[PDB]
């Protein structure tokens, strides 16, 4: 409605100083984003000044015990592209009332790694490639799926233009701008090989914020698909039959690698990655993660292995 | 039709100083909000400066006895998020032409309680959690209700995002901004365990204003569902079959609780509520009733009642 | 389309000084409003400065004989809420080319009454309640009419809120603002007992202007229902079968009633009305109703 | 809905100095436009300052062997009419990682021709007429195709107006303004003989920028048909059966032609064109057409 | 489908002597008919030669789950107008495995009354008028219910003809013939005052068979509405709002009356023309023949 | 469409003496019925006089090996209710070209059991109850599934009548008459607890023919749902969520159990069944039995106890069981097996 969108787009700065904060977290599947919103007395840019919150963990498959309460710790702030003004998104990680990180909290361990002085001094930069597929809500097939099936790896959809080739660009372009506005370092987008299939890239992002941003980007994307009435999947294999997906390739570089200087340093890091069990060379790419893996794990494991691990 | 919203959204400040006041009241079922609007000469911020009004109680199940007139007393003003500008919402309570509160007027007795020096000195604060369900107008099942029916208490709807999980968010978000604009102390919202089910929280709100705000929040919400062509229910059990609803839990604290040695005041307060007969511990929580009644009963039982 | 509304909403002040004037009149059924629009060189606020106009009365059931021409006399100006800017609505009344009021022109005799020095001195104020029903275009039953039919006098529609109770509020709220914008003294609105049934109140309005304003308000409402694709009826009994309508009560006060003490003036006025602050009088033409009240209490001699 | 277009239409200048660049290239069929977008730190007006990029050529039928990587060289900048603000469109041509132009890269050779001192000194101007057909997505027949088939070369569609004659004008007018905004020298448009068939002209455009501009205009057009949910064809024969198409006629003038003009210089150019087989030369790649005329008339010696 | 109706209309007499018997009973609400079918070796006309059967009473609100078996006693036979041929309908009443009538079995007590020598010798005849309403499956409003709603008691529907007046006559005429074919003494039909509203009359019917026949006729009617995709209600008030229903009038005569009425009318008042038909019919006999003031 | 059904319903006896035989078999999932049809020179009543046939086993998940040919052995004849006249249905079991039964051929071992003199002398009768669900083709939810979802175990659908209660009776009544016409010993039908859920019973049928008849009855049902444009499921849980399904309960009696003294014989058989329980469950939790307590593994029934003779019910098999396995295992355990 036009009456409805007017209420949704009300600018609160004209009526008070209160802001709305959307607290966001990863649910019990490790892939389900959850959120809810609260009012704060005034604008906030420092996450550490945000109050902690809580939710019912037995409703998100995260607290089975007699105590269902789970605590939310604010960790990163972004501008809310939906509520606009001084309203914000808050990426949180999740803990028991006693202060223990939940098993589905991957940020905790990642934060320990990125806070290590020898990792922190190396200024690790990350570039993440996030593929996704837009799906018809009723049928669960990708937008533009051709009547008659699987089209193949050589087709008109990859970076295509036109009503018969690019399906869902409105969602994609809305997302690109929403992310820039929010403060995410989104570095690009492209239409992928399958109809309704797309990719966005994020980076360079330093350390723990790479994970914060990617989760923030996924949140915004699904909020946008929600508006459009379309289902989004980050699964590498979102439908049966043949399917061409990429994965979740991660580009990585340190202060030493970027100061050449250490062209050689890139190669030894690659040596270390091979030693642990895909990797190509500036910076280098890691080709093992799939499109739904947790970025906190992926990014921190690369730093640990290349900066802290000794066989 | 774009021609229509242009008219609805006209800025009257450009043409004169007159304002429109939407007078709101609780009807004969104790849960049905009613309203109508009048033009006033200029901007008003003090409810005591508003004229009294009236309506036909025989049309809202509030006047049987040969005299159908019921009187409206303005009690609280909020900004009107629908008409915008200087136009206002007016929460009223209802009286006979003779000056007596109607049986369905719960504000009067609640106000008497909050006006008592022993209550007023304790500065009672209230926090209310209002759960509600958004229902398809034609089928009366919740928005997004799954074909197989009751999904269970463990699902993707609670605080969910995405077309297949969150149903009716445009309404929820419209309501959130609308209340803040209106001047209600809405403190947050969340998607609940069932599809189409949500919650908003209001507070802390002082004394009689908790009820004023709650009714105002309910009014705004149902005005918004009206626009969206959706039905709203505040019933804990809004459909047959299995259902997970919470209720309307109420948080309460006094000045004594908020200061030094609240621990004792809190347990004692709980003891008296128990002695009268659902209560758990900052402050404490008390588990479709009228908020004027609920909030004032808590103050009275804990501050005025002497066993 | 959005291309269309852009053209409809052009601000003519940006391109010239010309304004558009919508001349409005009551047709041969006594309840059908008609209008058409003309271009004038510049802004006008004084009705007496508007040129007279004309139309084919044989197309509106208002001229049977060999000369079908009917003359329009501008009588009242309001701002046009549809064209916006300096464009205006013009309430006219209607005459033969020779200068005689048509039988369906009720403003003429009303004007004589309000022009009478004894009436004019009393500054009569009117408050008029206009009930109306919004009807589905195809079925001609009210918006929100329930499958089972007539619901009874006790229901959720009266001053109701919600998708299942208030039917047509967008029209009603558009009208309220449109009337205020136009310069009509609209004093309030409410949902009525039947679904799709509503009321607006106008006043206080002075003398002959009560009728001019009520007619302008009816005009504006029906232009709005036209936009919404809904039919409107001002008939107290707009559908067959059982139905609750209120009516059209008219509140009335003279200068004398409004001063000290007035109660006595009110007493006598009430007696004369029966025989033939303020007080209330229990599809009619507002020109007739209001002027008859003034005449009965100020000019008539029992 | 309206929420979606708000996000798409966000002005990024309010949040940072970063811009979005849409890299565009010709795919493996020689007629398929492809593109994707990346974030840059600040505004750029010089193509030579833009970073090179890459894509998977095995996905656009442009790299078969074990190395599917293809390099994009930015060549021309236009403002992005879709993202607005300081966002840009970037016309690119394509190379192997080793630095060799791909077979489907026609810009490379044209650029050698226009950079040649004997060509460059003559400032070749080009005027290109681009015909196209708007097709129903589901049926693949032109918009407004009549129940009964091919209407003939004599009809109401050529430069027509009205719902029954002009099909897809909203696309055409969006494109016209979009191209002007972008910085393309679009010189006019017209409805053509077949329903849903139209033409745009570009020029005068100097040298290599003629081809850059036509490709950018084709890109903008298909992005617009995409928004409209309509298919576009630049094929001279976009459906079976009889059909009236023009082609891609190219106008050409040299500095000397614009001087005296003399006409003799024109005669000479025409003569040389004949020998190999301003003035007019009657879906091909504009880089090829434009550069061959320049080569033949300025470099080629009989 | 013609392929489907060909299978449904197969004449089993052409392939064997086996027949199908549809056992019918009254469920736990007292108004819900239930049935299921079994194969028998050959034609049967004597209800007492039919085997008893059983069902899960916990699925029809007539037994608890821990002890759910309920026994079906065959009581009356009719020809089955749906399966045709030698196939039959069997009206049953219902008992615990120990042999007691279920509380929702009203036939048992009615049978005792009609078996009483003071009643049986008097040959009580019954005429029953059964009103019903045909309802649109999706809306639950009557067939032909007018857009503007409740029309009033004076209208064109009563005994009407035409597309705009008679709604559901196909169902009604099918029912009339089906009942006659089945062996029910259906004595007439008429369109009623409300749209989609109808009545059939059964009688004269002797004693306990009046109840058997009415239930059999109700069965046949709802099987027919099932075919037509229409819902049936025997409720006097089948929709909210105003409605014109008759009631449940019952005609009654004894052997003595047919040869008198006033003494019976007197007896009825303290407690000619006057819910479960077994109850209604037997209580009238009891009132006028067995009762003690 | 009447033009089409006229062709389908042609009486071939008026045009020739040739008949059409629909050879039917169980495919590689153990539940997928397959069939195809051939022309034979004249009418046939003796299955042993029908020629063998073959099919491509790599197309029904029944021959992975390099030789995809699988052989069809005719075993049972029924009249074809679809083609009518002298046209027939032929229940087959399936073998390698070399002559060995396929792993998915369960008839073979069952036949070996029913041919044993100790089983045959005993004349085992079987009664099988086949529950099934009719599903809307597009949504995969049952016919008549209510807008608000799962209704519960106490409702109006069980043996119900009316447009709002009984869903799919045309299919059910067509199937009942088609089976009778075909020569199958179908003994009854009823509407079940869930919307669109129904049951039919077959029996008493002696020995190996019980399985032949059950499979023929299943074939006919799915051929009828195909005509109706409806999907049929014999799965114990044809939809997610709560669901009330029974299974495929099997009644069993020997000549001795049916005569006087029979109850003592029944108890001994039940004892033997209990000693095996795990073997039977694995093929078809804690073994139990009684007369009217659910969910006993085995039920005797009031009538049997009362009379001192009759039969007993094995309530363990699920609705998608292979009747050859169930029927023959009951005979084997109670008549041939030595603990």
Numbering used by the authors:
A (entry chain G): 1 to 277, 314 to 317, 327 to 356
B (entry chain F): 1 to 277, 314 to 317, 327 to 332, 337 to 356
C (entry chain J): 1 to 276, 327 to 332, 337 to 356
D (entry chain H): 1 to 277, 328 to 332, 337 to 356
E (entry chain E): 1 to 259, 265 to 276, 329 to 331, 338 to 356
F (entry chain A): 1 to 284, 302 to 356
Quote the study on this structure.
The first step of nitrogen assimilation in higher plants, the energy-driven incorporation of ammonia into glutamate, is catalyzed by glutamine synthetase. Glutamine synthetase (GS; EC 6.3.1.2) is a vital enzyme in the nitrogen metabolism of all living systems. Consistent with the diversity of metabolic roles, GS exists in plants as a number of isoenzymes, located both in the cytosol (GSII-1) and in the plastids (GSII-2), that are encoded by a small gene family. MtGSII-1a is expressed in the vascular bundles of all plant organs and is highly up­regulated in the nodules, accounting for the production of over 90% of the total nodule GS activity.
The three-dimensional structure of M. truncatula GSII-1a was determined at 2.35 Å resolution by X-ray crystallography using synchrotron radiation. The crystallographic model revealed a decameric arrangement of the enzyme with D5 symmetry, with two stacked (face-to-face) pentameric rings. The ten MtGSII-1a monomers adopt very similar conformations, as highlighted by the r.m.s.d. of 0.35–0.65 Å for 291–311 aligned Cα atoms. The extensive contacts established between the subunits that compose each ring result in a buried inter-monomer surface of approximately 3500 Å2. The overall buried inter-ring surface amounts to ∼2500 Å2, i.e. approximately 500 Å2 per individual monomer–monomer interaction, highlighting the weakness of the inter-ring contacts. Considering the contacting monomers A and F from opposed rings, hydrophobic interactions exist between the side chain of Trp141A and both Ile147F and Gly148F, as well as between Gly148A and the side chain of Trp141F. In this particular case, the structure of the apo form of the enzyme was determined and therefore there are no ligands present in any of the ten active centres. In all of the MtGSII-1a monomers a segment comprising the Thr293–Ala299 region, homologous to the Glu-binding loop of bacterial glutamine synthetases, is disordered, leaving open the entrance to the glutamate-binding site at the narrower end of the active-site cavity. Despite the remarkable structural similarity between MtGSII-1a (r.m.s.d. of 0.98–1.03 Å for 320–322 aligned Cα atoms) and its closest structurally characterized homologue, ZmGSII-1a, there are some critical differences between the two enzymes. There is also a concerted movement of several segments of MtGSII-1a, notably the ∼180° rotation of Ala246, with its side chain now protruding into the glutamate-binding pocket, and the ∼90° rotation of the upstream Trp243 side chain that packs against Pro248 and leads to a rearrangement of the Lys237–Asp242 segment.
